[PDB]
Symmetry: D3
Subunit: 251 residues, 6 copies
C-alpha cells in the first residue's frame, strides 16, 4: 500500500515536494500546513502525521518526527526516499542562558551530540552542523518579522530529564557524567536543550541533505517562570511564521 515502511506515504502524495517542515508534535502539523495554500491531510501513522500544502505555487510537505533521534531518523530517511532534500525543524524550547528571554527565537548553528542516533551516521568527531543556506534563510526570516534572535549552539539530549539535569523526578538521581553537565554547557555558551537536532543535523550533513532548525523560547531555566498559554501560542505562531518564510527562500 505504502512506498515506505513507516510514514504511509507514496511519491504521488508529495506532488513533487522537495522541502519538508518537520515539527515534533503530530498535532502541530495541521496548524503549520494551514498557514500555506491548499492544505491537505496525507497520512497519520504512529507518531508521523503528514500534510501537504503549497508555498508560492510549489508543493511543500509538513511531517511530524515524534520525540527523539530514532523516530526523527526514520522520518528523514523515508521523506528522502520520497524526494525531500531540505528539512526545516520548527520547535518550542527552554533556554539555559540568562540573556535569552521568553518569546525570543533561537536559530541553531550546530548541536552538542548528547544522543545515540547521530552515531549511526557519523562518528562523534563529526560535527552536528546545520546547512548554511537553511540557517541563513531562518536568520533572514526572523529578522523580516522583527524577532529577537539568538544564533548558536543547542544541546541535543536523548532524554528530557536526566540528560537535561532535571532532579524533580521519580528517582531524583542523575548519572555521574550528566551531573553538573548543564553548568558545563552554560559556561560554553550553549543556548538551550532540545531532543532532535543532534540526529537531524548529523544525519542530513552526512547524507547530502540540507537541514536547519528554529525554535521559540517558552521558558528560561535561569529565571524560570510558569509559561502563559496565551504567550506560548503567540510564540509558537511567531516561530511557525519564520519557518514558513524561510522555506519560501529555499524552494
Amino acid at each position: 500500500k505504502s512506498d515506505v515502511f513507516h510514514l504511509g506515504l507514496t511519491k504521488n502524495d508529495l506532488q513533487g515536494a522537495t522541502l519538508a517542515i518537520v515539527p515534533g508534535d503530530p498535532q502541530r502539523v495541521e496548524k503549520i500546513a494551514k498557514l500555506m495554500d491548499n492544505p491537505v491531510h496525507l497520512a497519520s501513522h504512529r507518531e508521523f502525521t503528514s500534510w501537504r500544502a503549497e508555498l508560492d505555487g510549489k508543493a511543500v510537505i509538513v511531517c511530524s518526527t515524534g520525540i527523539g533521534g530514532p523516530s526523527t531518523s526514520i522520518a528523514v530517511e523515508e521523506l528522502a526516499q520520497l524526494g525531500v532534500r531540505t528539512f526545516l525543524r520548527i520547535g518550542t524550547t527552554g533556554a539555559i542562558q540568562p540573556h535569552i528571554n521568553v518569546g525570543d527565537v533561537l536559530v541553531t548553528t550546530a548541536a552538542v551530540r548528547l544522543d545515540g542516533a547521530s552515531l549511526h551516521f557519523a562518528p562523534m568527531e563529526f560535527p552536528a552542523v546545520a546547512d548554511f543556506s537553511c540557517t541563513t534563510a531562518l536568520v533572514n526570516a526572523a529578522k523580516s518579522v522583527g524577532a529577537t534572535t539568538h544564533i548558536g549552539i543547542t544541546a541535543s539530549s536523548d532524554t528530557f530529564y536526566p540528560g537535561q539535569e532535571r532532579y524533580d523526578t521519580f528517582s531524583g538521581r542523575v548519572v555521574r557524567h550528566f551531573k553538573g553537565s548543564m553548568e558545563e554547557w552554560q559556561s560554553m555558551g550553549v543556548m538551550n536543550y532540545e531532543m532532535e537536532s543532534a540526529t537531524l543535523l548529523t544525519m542530513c550533513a552526512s547524507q547530502g541533505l540540507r537541514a536547519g532548525m528554529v525554535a521559540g523560547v517558552i521558558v528560561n531555566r535561569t529565571q524560570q517562570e510558569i509559561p502563559n498559554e496565551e504567550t506560548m501560542k503567540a510564540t509558537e505562531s511567531h516561530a511557525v511564521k519564520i519557518v514558513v518564510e524561510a522555506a519560501r527562500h529555499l524552494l
Copy 2:
C-alpha cells in the same frame, strides 16, 4: 491540567495501576486494552496513547512509547511518577539467527546497547538486563500458550536503517563502525534487532523498576521472506496474549 509533562495524565487516571504494558505504536494500544476488563481511553498526547483496563480485578495501564529510546524514556519516567513499578514491552521483530522462525516468540534477557538514552541512566558497563520475575512470567506465559520460544539477547538500535545494516536506502551508506556489525552480533548469538529495549531495560534496572520484553517474529533476515499481513497480525496477537498472561502473574 495533567500531572505530567507529556502523557496528558493525572494520578487518578490510573485508578491505582502499578503495571503498564508498553507497545511502540499508539494505534495498537486500544487492541491490547480490549483483551482485558472495562477498557477505557485515558489520553492521546503526541505519540503517547494510553488506555486503562482491569486484569483479575486490578487496574492496568496500556501506554504507547513511540519509536526509540528518547520517547520511551519519557513514557517510563512519567508513568513511574504516576505509580507504575512494572513495565512489560510487547513488539514484533525480525530475527537474525537461522534457527528462529516466523511466528516464534522471543523473550529478551538483556540488550546490546546500540542506543543513546540508556547512557543517560547508567554508563555502558552497566547491563541492559531484564527483571527476572518479568522474564520468568513471560517465559511461563509463552510455554502455557504453546509458543515456540527463544530466550536470549536482543540488539537494541537507535536507528531502523544503518544501525540494523540496511543498505536499500537513500544513500546506501552504512558508517564504518556499523558496517559488518550484524555479522558480529550473529556470531555472538544475538537473536534479533529492535529499537527500545536497551533504553527500557537499562532505565528500569537502574531506577528500581521491573521490566521485561517479549516479541513475535515476523521476518528472518537470514532466510528473508515478505511477511504475510495475516501472519503478522496473528503473530502480533499471539505475542499480545503472552504479555497479558505474563502480567496476570506480576500483579
Copy 3:
C-alpha cells in the same frame, strides 16, 4: 601429555561431563566434589584444581578458576574444548545494599563490566547476562533449601581494592573514575562486588555456552561486621548445596 595448554586435563578425565561447577579457590574444589558421588582428584596445575564427581549417575567436573577474568577465561575455554557447555559459578561475597544480610544468597542476572577480559569477547555495549535456564535452576535450588535470596545485578571488578573503592590501602588513593563509583552502583540497585562474573557471563553468552552464578553473603559494607568463621563456613556450605542442587536440573 595434556589435551589443553593450562588445565592439565584430557577428554577422558571428564568421562563425558558437560557441566562444570567453577569456584575461585583451588582449595574449595575438593569440598564441592565430595558432596557428590565417587569424587576423584583429576589435576592441579597453577590456579586450576579439578575434581570429577557423579550427580544422579552423570559425571560432573569441579574446576577452580583463580581470581579474575583472565584465569577464568582460560578455564572456561579449555573446559569448553573438553566438552563442558554449562558453567555454574559458586562464590562467597560482600554486599553493598542495606537490605541484604549476612547468610543471604545472591543470584546474579547480569554483571556491571568493570573488567578487561569481557571486552576480548564482545564490545562494551554487549550485556554480561547470565543464561536463563542456569539462573532459573539456581533460584529454584535456593528456594528448595529455604534460602533468603536476592536476584539482580553484580558489579564485577578487575581489582579487589580501588575498583571496589577501598581506601585502607598502601597508597590510600582511588583513581578519579572509580572515586565515588560505589555510591553510583548502590543508587542503581547493584547488589555486590566480585571479580569474575563480567568475564564469565560475557564470554559464555557470546560463545554459545550456558553460565550462571550464585554466592553466599559473608559481609555487608553498609553495616560492616567482622565475619565469624562458623557462620562463613555455614554460608559456604549453604551456597554449595544450592549450586549442586541447581546442577541436578541442568544435566
Copy 4:
C-alpha cells in the same frame, strides 16, 4: 617584558585591535598586513609572528599560529588576553571531493575533530562550529570578488601524514583507525583536510569568541595534479583578499 608568555606582545602593541587574522605560516603574516593601512611588525617569537595594520580606520592584528592545534591554542588564548574577540583563519588546502576545483574557495561551517587540543576545551560531543557572523562575512566576501565557493565541513587533523591517509612516507604505515578514514569522510561530504580548524573553532565557540575559516584550494586528492607555484600564490592571494574583505564587515 611582554604581557603574555609566548607571543612577545603587550596590550599596547595592538592599539585597540579586537580582530585577528590568523594564518599558519609566520612568513605569510607580513604579506597579509600590507593589504591594509600602516602595516607594522609587532613581534616574532618562536612560530608567532605578529603585525599590526589598520582596516577602515580600525587597528587589526595579523598573527601566525604555527602548524597544529597546540600552537594555535596558545596564539588564540594570548590574543584573547590582549583583547581579540574575533579570529579569522586563512589557509590553502587540498580538497577530497571531485566537484571542488583548484582555485576554488572553501568556507568551513564546522570541523571533524581529528585533533587533540579541542578536547581541552570541550568534550567530543561539542560541535567544532564556526561563528555565523564570521561565516556569513566570508561567504559574502567570496561572492563579492567572484569566487567559486564551497560551504561545508572540513576534516581537521593533528597530522599531515597518517591522519590524512598519506602512504608515501618513511614507514608507509597508517594505523588501523585512520586506514580507510579518507573514504569515510568523502562519503559524508567532507570537503577537505587541514590541521587547525578543529582547535580554533571548538576553542572559540566554547570561550565566547567568534571564529571563521576560509581556504583556497591548491590540489584535489581525487584528481591529483602537481600544483603550479604561480597558481598556488594566486589562490593564496585570492583567499587573503576574501579574509580581509570579510574582516571589514566584522569590525
Copy 5:
C-alpha cells in the same frame, strides 16, 4: 591470622624484605627461591605461593601472581602493605617479531595495555612504563650472562586466546576489535604477548613502586615451532638467573 586478605602472610614473614620476584606460576616459586640463601616456604593460599630467601645477606620474597592483572594487582598491593617496594617479574613468552629467536631474552620497557586492571590505577593515557633502575638492572644482568637481548614494548593481554589472536579454539571466533590486532602490534615493533605486565607496570608506576620485567622466548609466532621441553626449561632457568642477578643490584 594473616596481616593481609589473600596472601596469608604477616609482616614478620618477610623478615625485612623490600624486594619481590613475582612469577606467574605458584609451582615455579620454590625453584626461584632455591637459587638464593636459606629458602623457606612462607605460605600457599589460592594462587599465591610465597617463599623467603636471602640474597647477599638481604631477605627477598618470591611470590606468585597467578595468571592475569586481577590476581597480580592483589599480590602487588598486599606485598606493598608488607613492605615490598620493588617488583621484578620473570616469565616465558612467545615473540611476534621475525628477528627474535627461541632462547632470546626480552626486557620490557613498557606495555600495550590490553588489560582491565591497569585502568583501576590510571586512565589509558598513562603509560604502562617500567622503572628505569629495574630495566637497567635487567639489561645489565642479561648482558653479564651472555644473553641475546631485545629491549622494547610488550603487548599485555587479559586473555590467552582471542586477545592474542588465537583461532584454534572452541568457537574459532575473534571479536572485531581484536581481529587483525596482532598485525597492528607487529607493525609498531611490539616484541611479544604476555598477560600481566600492563597491570604490574601501570600499578607500580602510579603507586610509587618500582617494577621491571624480563622473559625468555620459548616460541616465535612468525616462525612457529613446537617448543622442546628441555629448551623451555633451559630458557626459563636462563631468565630466572637474569632476574636474580638484576635483584642483587637493586637491593
Copy 6:
C-alpha cells in the same frame, strides 16, 4: 627545490647525519649547533629552523619542532625521510612535584598522552615510551656533568593552559575532565608538564625510530617562584651540554 614538504631541506644538507637534536624553539637551534664543530645554518621555514654541526667527526642535525605534536610529527617524519633515525628532545620545563628543584634535570621514560597526534600513530593503549639506549645516554650524560636528575613520567599536553590546569586565563574555565587533573598526575608521581613528548615518543616507538627527552627545570608549581634570567640561561646551557654529551654516545 626541497626534498621534503615543510623543512626546506635536501638529503645533501644533512651530509650523512642520522641523529637529530630537536628543541622546540627555532631560536634555540643556533645555540645548540654552536656547541659542536663546524656549525652551519641549513634552512628556516615556518617553525622549522635547522643547523648542521659535527660531533666527534660525524654530522649531526639540530632542528626545531615548534610547539605541539602536530608540528613535531612533521619534523620527525621529514627528518626520517632525510635519514635521521635517532631523535633527542631538549627542553626547559616546569615541575609539579615538591622534591624537584629549579636547576634540576628531568629525563623522561614515558609520557602521559594528553595529546592528539600520538593517536595518529598508535591507539591509546600503546605506551608513549622512550628508547632505552637514548634514555640511558641521557642519564649517563647528566651524571657525567654532575646534574641533579629525576627519571620518570611526563604529562604531555596539547595545550599550555587548560590541559595544564591554568586558571589565570581569558575565560578562567577548565573543562570538566581536566579540572582536578593536575592533582591526579601529582598523586601518580608524574614529574612535569610539557607539550611534545607524547607525540614524539609514540611516533618514534611505533615507527622504528629512537627517541629520548631531557629537560632542565626552570619553575616548580608547588613552590612557584618567578624565574631569574641568569638561572634560566644557566639551566638551558646545562641541559644542552647533557643532550650533546648523550648524542656522542648514540652516533
